[PDB]
């Protein structure tokens, strides 16, 4: 028996919120002074956005603590009740629009028009104005660069200008899933500006902590903020529902801006400020070429007047060589403990060379299909953000080092022009374009040459999955018991809301027939989502902060701590697989689902994902990394084709997922609704077999996205081509209404009959599923050695 202490869960989430808010500007108006009266503007104050919309935004809760309630509960300030009542009375006639069905909730709410009388009267009886701008986000559509979406509405702009005129102290808070336009806000020029993201059901509590100074803000931006949407390198090749060419290649986010267009940046990657000031002093530097590491030290000192944390960020500048390189790539970071005024902390990091290697997808280095360090000078930088990072040390290689030999995989099927760094006389870099080489992989031959060996069936075998778990028999001996019906059944997830598992969840898998359950294969339960359990029964669960807020902490430990509670909460609800982390790269600011992902940077992306997974693993629960890979746009997501180079895949898009496997111990992946390099991801052999298993060494399961399409290359997509799915080693079709009855009328057995699917391929998937299933808490329930959870302190 293990106690889930609900108050400690709350405190853990609250800590994430108070570390994840990002202070952008402040003239001393924050923190709020003890005893201040605050006037809160913005009708969204009454309906705090705790999450985005969609699959990862449907956690049921008894109560949400918004910003006004958080401030009142702090006992540090009071709120102007007259103004609150004006908003309340207006909202009775202008109700919050919840939408009508899936994806229909608008991503902002109409703002209340303000008069000089209301704003003047508020100023007369309060000390400071707080203006809350609210945006939400979600599945199936992207932000438009228009009023009410990425830009302020006319009525919001009016609100901001009136407040600015009447109040000498003005704070702006952005209660947003993803970043919005800051140009007009910056021109209006409030005294302080803070991004507060969407903090889950206790978001107001953690936000009050930072506003009142109980906690000194320490969050940092996980994306670059440029002046215009058209400045982002992906914008030219983003938003087409049919096909988008990833022409920017490795030059995503700060990899582009710092290299080519520094002056287009308003706020750099890793930027964030505090109520105190810090001094970063570069320290000792050594390199160990034989171990393929360097070790770098610095000291961070609090040089201002109040306690706080800061983040030391380390970057590498690789020599341009023949491939071309970004100016700087993030290779390590460390958030200090709370530092009192005048105190300091020494930070030391050891960085493997693989963190700043480049993938040679042309052969120009002499090592085609390898991660490499080209000969030349490597310079290391440390500082407060990528722009304000300064030389830590350097070392020089006289010859190329191959860090890993890989293969030609997931290569583009058509040529396109990509960006390429080009050196100028004055030392600057400019963009030129070059043709990306086209795949020459014989996919048919690759599958045949790597075909697994069939295990001869034996229906008299009475081995239980318990006998495999105990070590008594090999998985191969057990799996011989599965009939062709059992094999076709086990690759089908059942849902949504299968009766085999906790009501109102996403899927049951494994023990999805009477015959499979008789072999002690348990029904394993899957459920959304990254921000908490979605229970369509109406049952309540903990609603946690959004993904971008988590990543903005730059603090894997606080993330891991919070998800350690989620680990127990899952066991309490008998959910084995939480459908997160969502961890697609932030390729463009307008992507609708950015809120539940982490960053434009693959290292930060993988490191935050890994922290979440480590938390979930604490008591033997698990997450599912999604969406593998290159689901960076919502418009046209059932059909759109992402055309991308091997180098960009290897260094940027796959890299976070690689880290989740190798650092996070990830054992479950979800593929996408869309196409990567000319076929759907659920049937892609290179993605799900060559890269994931044979190169990275993943041991686990791969599942489709829910009712995803699958195809054979060049063939038509369908929702029942499970043969193509199994031929790729995508193990689980999510989902069918009735797995045992083959409710989707799938082609597993017909393709097996015709020799187009090999029994060995089905057996490989069945073994992946059973090996996964036997290590879950659902298996432990069958063995009577599960953890029983009791919730205390409600």
Author numbering: 5 to 798
Task: Quote the authors verbatim.
Here, activity screening of a metagenomic library created from rumen fluid led us to the isolation of a novel β-glycosidase, GlyA1, which was assigned to the GH3 family. Activity was confirmed for 18 substrates that revealed that GlyA1 is a GH3 member with clear β-glucosidase and β-xylosidase activities, but also possessing β-galactosidase, β-fucosidase, α-arabinofuranosidase, and α-arabinopyranosidase activities at low level in this order. Structural analysis illustrates the permuted domain composition of GlyA1 that is composed of an N-terminal (α/β)6-sandwich domain, followed by the FnIII domain, and the (α/β)8 barrel domain.
The low numbers of crystals impeded analysis of the intact protein by mass spectrometry, but SDS-PAGE analysis of protein solution samples revealed the presence of two bands after incubation at room temperature or treatment with proteases. Therefore, the sample was incubated with subtilisin previously to the crystallization step, which accelerated formation of many good quality crystals, under similar conditions and with the same space group. These crystals were cryoprotected into 20% glycerol, and this molecule was found bound at the active site. Xylose and glucose are bound in an identical position, and the glycerol molecules observed in the ligand-free crystals are mimicking the positions occupied by C2, C3, C4, and C5 from both sugars. Furthermore, the traced loops showed significant conformational changes in the different crystals at Trp-111, coupled to a change in Phe-147 from the adjacent 139–152 loop, reinforcing its intrinsic mobility.
